Design a protein around this ligand. Structure first.
Ligand code: CL
Lengths: 21, 141
């Protein structure tokens, strides 16, 4: 059969202020 | 740009699953070695192969050398861009725990997430990536 790996964008690289709050 | 956080998806006998997480930065895809073990990865009709890798360090870079060089100062909180399997990405702010090793002083994230979350990037307040989740961070100014 087939084994494959691939990339799927999940997020920008960024700090989030709300995550602190 | 192509710069960002990516799920490393895999498909085979076990159906489709999230093998891990990685970061595209300065035209290099960074992840943990055990996630891919040096296998090729597709990027839209374009395959990436390992450029540099270390099994013992459990780090691997596709398309160029490891680009991240910033370290944790051992004081300030960091944020992890947590990319869990089957859930939207989220930023989690946390304080790493300092730990001493024979190789040097190290920081590690106390948070616990499922297997395929490994590789989620750890950022400092400047937005610089200082390590990947499941691998930890180094101490330094
Ligand atoms: Cl960690």
């Amino acid at each position: 059969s087939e084994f494959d790996m691939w990339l799927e964008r999940a997020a920008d690289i960024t700090w989030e202020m709300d995550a602190a709050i | 740009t192509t710069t960002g956080v990516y799920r490393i998806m895999a498909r085979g006998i076990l159906g489709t699953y999230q093998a891990g997480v990685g970061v595209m930065y300065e035209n290099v895809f960074h992840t943990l070695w055990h996630t891919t073990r040096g296998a090729a990865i597709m990027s839209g009709e374009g395959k990436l192969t390992p450029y540099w890798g270390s099994v013992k360090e459990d780090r691997i870079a596709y398309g160029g050398p490891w680009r991240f060089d910033r370290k944790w100062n051992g004081t300030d909180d960091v944020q992890v861009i947590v990319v869990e399997p089957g859930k939207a990405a989220v930023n989690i702010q946390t304080k790493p725990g300092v730990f001493k090793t024979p190789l040097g002083e190290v920081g590690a994230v106390s948070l616990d997430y499922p297997r395929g979350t490994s590789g989620s990037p750890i950022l400092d307040s400047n937005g610089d990536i200082i390590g990947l989740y499941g691998n930890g961070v180094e101490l330094g100014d």
